[PDB]
Amino acid sequence: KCTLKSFTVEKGIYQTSNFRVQPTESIVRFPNITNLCPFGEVFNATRFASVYAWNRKRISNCVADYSVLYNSASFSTFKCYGVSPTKLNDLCFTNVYADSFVIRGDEVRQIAPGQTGKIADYNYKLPDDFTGCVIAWNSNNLDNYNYRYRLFRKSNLKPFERDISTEIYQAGSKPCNGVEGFNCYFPLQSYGFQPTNVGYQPYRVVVLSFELLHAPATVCGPKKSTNLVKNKCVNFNFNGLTGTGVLTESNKKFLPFQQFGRDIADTTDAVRDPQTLEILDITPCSFGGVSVITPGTNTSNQVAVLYQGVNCTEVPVAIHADQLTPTWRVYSTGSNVFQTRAGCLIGAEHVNNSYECDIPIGAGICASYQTQSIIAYTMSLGAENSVAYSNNSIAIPTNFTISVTTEILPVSMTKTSVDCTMYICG
Amino acid sequence: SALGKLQNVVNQNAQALNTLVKQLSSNFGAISSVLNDILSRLDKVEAEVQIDRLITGRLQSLQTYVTQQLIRAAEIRASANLAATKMSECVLGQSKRVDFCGKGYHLMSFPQSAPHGVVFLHVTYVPAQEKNFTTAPAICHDGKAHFPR
Amino acid sequence: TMSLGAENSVAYSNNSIAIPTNFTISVTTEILPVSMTKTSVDCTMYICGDSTECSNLLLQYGSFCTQLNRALTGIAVEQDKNTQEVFAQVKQIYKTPPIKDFGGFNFSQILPDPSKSKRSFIEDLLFNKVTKFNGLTVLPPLLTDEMIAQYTSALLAGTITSGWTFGAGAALQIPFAMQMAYRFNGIGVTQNVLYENQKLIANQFNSAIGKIQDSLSSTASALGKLQNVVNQNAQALNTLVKQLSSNFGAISSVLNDILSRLDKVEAEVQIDRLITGRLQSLQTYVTQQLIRAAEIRASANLAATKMSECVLGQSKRVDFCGKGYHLMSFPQSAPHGVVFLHVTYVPAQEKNFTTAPAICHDGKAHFPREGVFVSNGTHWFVTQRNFYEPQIITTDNTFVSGNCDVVIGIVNNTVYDP
Amino acid sequence: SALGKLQNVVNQNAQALNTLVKQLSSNFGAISSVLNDILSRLDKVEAEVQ
Amino acid sequence: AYTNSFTRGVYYPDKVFRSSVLHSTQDLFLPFFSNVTWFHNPVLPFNDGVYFASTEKSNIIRGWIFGTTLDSKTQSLLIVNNATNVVIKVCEFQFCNDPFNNCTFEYVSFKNLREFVFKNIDGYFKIYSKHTPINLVRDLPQGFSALEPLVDLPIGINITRFQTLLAAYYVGYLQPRTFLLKYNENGTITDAVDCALDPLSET
Numbered sequence A: 001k002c003t004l005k006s007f008t009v010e011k012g013i014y015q016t017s018n019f020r021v022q023p024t025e026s027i028v029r030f031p032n033i034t035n036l037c038p039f040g041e042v043f044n045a046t047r048f049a050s051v052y053a054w055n056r057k058r059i060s061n062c063v064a065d066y067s068v069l070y071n072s073a074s075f076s077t078f079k080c081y082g083v084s085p086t087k088l089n090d091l092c093f094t095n096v097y098a099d100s101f102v103i104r105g106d107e108v109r110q111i112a113p114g115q116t117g118k119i120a121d122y123n124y125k126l127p128d129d130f131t132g133c134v135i136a137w138n139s140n141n142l143d144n145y146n147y148r149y150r151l152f153r154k155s156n157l158k159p160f161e162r163d164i165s166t167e168i169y170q171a172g173s174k175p176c177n178g179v180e181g182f183n184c185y186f187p188l189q190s191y192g193f194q195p196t197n198v199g200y201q202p203y204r205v206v207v208l209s210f211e212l213l214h215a216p217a218t219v220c221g222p223k224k225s226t227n228l229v230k231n232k233c234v235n236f237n238f239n240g241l242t243g244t245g246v247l248t249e250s251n252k253k254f255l256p257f258q259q260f261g262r263d264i265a266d267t268t269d270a271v272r273d274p275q276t277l278e279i280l281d282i283t284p285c286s287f288g289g290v291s292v293i294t295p296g297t298n299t300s301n302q303v304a305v306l307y308q309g310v311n312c313t314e315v316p317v318a319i320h321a322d323q324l325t326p327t328w329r330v331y332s333t334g335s336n337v338f339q340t341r342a343g344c345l346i347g348a349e350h351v352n353n354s355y356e357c358d359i360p361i362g363a364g365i366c367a368s369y370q371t372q373s374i375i376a377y378t379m380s381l382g383a384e385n386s387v388a389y390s391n392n393s394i395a396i397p398t399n400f401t402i403s404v405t406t407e408i409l410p411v412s413m414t415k416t417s418v419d420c421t422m423y424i425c426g
Numbered sequence B: 001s002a003l004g005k006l007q008n009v010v011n012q013n014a015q016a017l018n019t020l021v022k023q024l025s026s027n028f029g030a031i032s033s034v035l036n037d038i039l040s041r042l043d044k045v046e047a048e049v050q051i052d053r054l055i056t057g058r059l060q061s062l063q064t065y066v067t068q069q070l071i072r073a074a075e076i077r078a079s080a081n082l083a084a085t086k087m088s089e090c091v092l093g094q095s096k097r098v099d100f101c102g103k104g105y106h107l108m109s110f111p112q113s114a115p116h117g118v119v120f121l122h123v124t125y126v127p128a129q130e131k132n133f134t135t136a137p138a139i140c141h142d143g144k145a146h147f148p149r
Numbered sequence C: 001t002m003s004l005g006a007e008n009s010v011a012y013s014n015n016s017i018a019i020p021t022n023f024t025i026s027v028t029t030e031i032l033p034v035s036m037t038k039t040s041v042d043c044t045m046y047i048c049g050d051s052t053e054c055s056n057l058l059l060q061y062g063s064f065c066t067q068l069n070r071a072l073t074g075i076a077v078e079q080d081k082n083t084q085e086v087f088a089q090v091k092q093i094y095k096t097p098p099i100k101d102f103g104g105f106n107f108s109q110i111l112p113d114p115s116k117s118k119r120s121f122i123e124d125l126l127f128n129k130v131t132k133f134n135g136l137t138v139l140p141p142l143l144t145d146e147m148i149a150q151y152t153s154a155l156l157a158g159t160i161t162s163g164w165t166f167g168a169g170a171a172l173q174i175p176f177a178m179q180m181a182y183r184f185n186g187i188g189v190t191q192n193v194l195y196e197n198q199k200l201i202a203n204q205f206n207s208a209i210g211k212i213q214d215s216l217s218s219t220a221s222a223l224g225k226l227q228n229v230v231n232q233n234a235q236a237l238n239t240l241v242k243q244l245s246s247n248f249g250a251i252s253s254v255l256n257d258i259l260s261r262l263d264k265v266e267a268e269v270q271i272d273r274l275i276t277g278r279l280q281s282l283q284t285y286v287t288q289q290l291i292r293a294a295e296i297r298a299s300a301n302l303a304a305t306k307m308s309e310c311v312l313g314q315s316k317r318v319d320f321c322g323k324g325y326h327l328m329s330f331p332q333s334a335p336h337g338v339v340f341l342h343v344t345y346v347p348a349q350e351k352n353f354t355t356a357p358a359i360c361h362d363g364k365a366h367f368p369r370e371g372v373f374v375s376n377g378t379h380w381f382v383t384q385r386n387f388y389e390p391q392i393i394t395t396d397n398t399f400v401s402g403n404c405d406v407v408i409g410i411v412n413n414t415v416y417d418p
Numbered sequence D: 001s002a003l004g005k006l007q008n009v010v011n012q013n014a015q016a017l018n019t020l021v022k023q024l025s026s027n028f029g030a031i032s033s034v035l036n037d038i039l040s041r042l043d044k045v046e047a048e049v050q
Numbered sequence E: 001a002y003t004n005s006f007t008r009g010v011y012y013p014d015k016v017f018r019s020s021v022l023h024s025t026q027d028l029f030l031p032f033f034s035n036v037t038w039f040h041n042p043v044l045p046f047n048d049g050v051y052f053a054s055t056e057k058s059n060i061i062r063g064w065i066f067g068t069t070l071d072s073k074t075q076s077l078l079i080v081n082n083a084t085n086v087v088i089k090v091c092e093f094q095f096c097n098d099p100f101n102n103c104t105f106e107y108v109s110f111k112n113l114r115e116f117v118f119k120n121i122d123g124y125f126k127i128y129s130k131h132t133p134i135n136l137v138r139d140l141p142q143g144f145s146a147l148e149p150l151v152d153l154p155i156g157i158n159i160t161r162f163q164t165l166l167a168a169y170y171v172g173y174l175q176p177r178t179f180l181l182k183y184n185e186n187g188t189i190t191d192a193v194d195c196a197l198d199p200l201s202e203t
Ligand SMILES: *[C@@H]1O[C@H](CO)[C@@H](O[C@@H]2O[C@H](CO)[C@@H](O)[C@H](O)[C@H]2NC(C)=O)[C@H](O)[C@H]1NC(C)=O
Pocket: A398, A399, A400, A401
């Protein structure tokens, strides 16, 4: 009724829902690495690099609790670009790269993807599709004249390019070459940091880049692993790849470098468990069109339910394993159940007689309301007739009937026309 | 339920227009689906962003309606071409084409008007009460073989 | 540069006629698609993959998922109607007689194999030559392939034992050598031409059916029209599936990446690009399936027409029921379609003759009642126009109209009086 | 006027193609319909949206 | 001296299993039927990446050196295979042109043909290899092979030039091309098409 937006329903078969086997368990697996990454040896490192010759540390083979770093209120910004910082503890990465440098605090605005500014042009450039976080804080304890940045260049530098060229850049043709002069300038100069400077004051900056390759992961959040379940519909997470499905033991001949497998559709089809080299197959939890078989509501409120393509052994637990309600699970746990090539049919009596097809089901099955209950049967193609042929017998009509058979044909639609401007813009 | 063909021409068009009309109430991710809300509540510089979502959704809604009506009109035209043919062959003549003008052998037919369509009353001969007989393909009278004209 | 065909200056002149003296019975295969593979797609499970956060955004687009489910359901039900209207033209399952006394014709290759589905021999060749789960589904047809093979066998058993009569009324038994004389008479060849050649005609038919098996077994190239229906639905489904992998401007094409890496306000912006792309990808599929369904419906209406006219009758529509003068045809089932074996008469071995429109006898013009006047060079005869059988010209072979002088090209002769 | 069916097949192809070409001049809400304007008036992060 | 490459030097492009499938990929590959240089050692350009191969008999070749200067002045990748393991260093130090500082990374792990591939991607060095018996003499043999990965080094070194550490061996250069790969039932690459080779391969 609610599918048709109507209080009356005509005799027929109607699709109304898609049935889905709901998962019963949640599994989390990661490599069991005991090491904690040395972020103190970054944010509390003694003295940071310049912006012209910034320092990169690859960070690896550990657990990391980024929520601790995110809670460090000294950080005046913690902005993130392809991730939201609260989510970091849920993930695992194939590498992390931390970039460390110092600037005057006003320049922090330049440390972002695709921006304009001399730091972005000549010192430190993120690609326009960067995935990571930017972290910065004031550092007047560093106040000092060592902190170089680049004021000119012959061209802008590339994404993650770096340039330790200490040349006297010839802005013109003149090869002044070892001493500065007109159109020939030394391109590095340094901030004079003192507490008497606020955007002119020393600030520490760290940029974290994350790596998300197809290879096995390397830096994981603190989320503790749990045990494994087979032949049941489960929610799952391996290394931060996530879904729901029937896991199984599997025979697939993975070569030792291959971490997970894919089907003809490129869908994820198998995985290797991060704590044990067994290959697990992944299969979808069963689903299929729910259709309701009904005589007209003018004749009965009895119905049958067809779970299309679903095997009858998977249906009955739909008490919690589908979108049901208490009276609706009677069409799951009780009554008659009948397997057909079209799917599992529930609430109709299988019959060994055959009749003309009243309501069609599929694969030669039809259903009807008869002596009363809904029945299901194989449809009948009409009475059999052995024609009395022989090489010398003929039959000739002795009489006839006129007949008058009605035939109906469509000829015209209604001549609708629509003003698109008045429909769209009112 | 005999007129199920003609009643479908009515129902399919009623569903097409009601779906086209109800889509005016959809938000498509705009602030509200009534344009006078946006135009009252918001400055032009913001309202353009909302109004372009309504234009994008309403235009796609209308393109889908017109495209389905082009396909449905071709189906109705196939029926009009068949009806024009049955009127030329069955009414204005006597068709010798099996099962074209109803089951049995065609004698004649009569057209009747109907809402959005046409109805033919096909008058046909049907043979009705046979008996068995012995038969042979030729008769030899004196040596000459005879066949029926 | 392609050749349009061998050239032929026809040996025309105003008093010369060419008349055939022999024939070849010929069996022509014809193949028509009748139904697509019935498909249905859950737009929520396709677009959103069992994410509720996605499913809530899709509600803002209103009617589209309901409207697409309606469109595909309308296609899917029509494929059962197309499959029904072609085969289900017969009201009773006529059953084949035990003894095969069909006057020398050998139907064993087109009637059922009793050892089995109950397909004929040729229906087994036809079944052998013709050849993911992201909320897409394939439904079974209503009629099973055994039911289809019972309908083709019922149509065939009626056609063999009772001629056209099983379409127009109750099926009347008739001996097959008599049915073929009615079919020969239907193409304007006199009944005696069958009986006087019955052994030759039976051998020509039996041999022609044999050549169909050799042709169908030897090459797949004939069944291209059916294999194309399979190939188009295979490419359409694969394109619809692979468009799940495209970004459309989102940070990933995998919906759980977006939901795991981003907080709601960012995530919703990314997801709405995937919704917009997947929704447009699904409308593009459904639009082509609606257009492709009308093409298959037009073919199913043509197949239903050929089954009424060629199988339940004998059509005079030139080149409709195979090239040549049409005698009869037999249906055979095939996956997603139907195959007709059109039996046709083709004339052969012509000779030139001199001819005239009329003959002068006693000052009055005589014209032939059926066929044409001819001379072999010395004697004048009348013959049926489709197969040379000269008769002595007589007052009951002919009819008369007025004096000699009006007719352009009349010739003098004796007309015999019985 | 007798050949109106054949002349429609010619006219419908011409009208369709002229409209497909003329649609290159439309904005669709973008800052310009000349692609090089977007490539020269904006930085990448804006230009890609347009 | 020279030989034709035939179809050799295909390798598994990623750490993924796929089976009974044709998959299309864009990557640095040896063009099919290219002109591999052959040698009886001299120092050579590395280009975008190298295919290196040699025929086994007496184990004369024991390693490689890569860089721009190689012999100090900047860091250079050194690779050795002896006694019981592969051994690797990235030193800015100096050594003789024959067998017997700032080593910011270290790692430890005719009858035959030995095949190797080198390129700079993610971490910026990679090694792939294959090793099989032969009966062909004094040429690169025809027939198919697919190199498995050995190692990925996170080392960030810049290379333009290289030299062999000490007969017959071969050199060829990778180029960015599209390939169609035949993964069999055991997820093994068993044939390939180089899409740029000829109009039939493009078809
Ligand atoms: C041919 O069939 C018709 C019926 O279709 C027969 O007509 C009926 O004859 C009986 C008497 O035998 C009457 O009671 C009925 O009222 C007649 N029906 C009609 C419609 O008039 C007819 O008798 C049959 N003729 C033969 C020779 O069998």
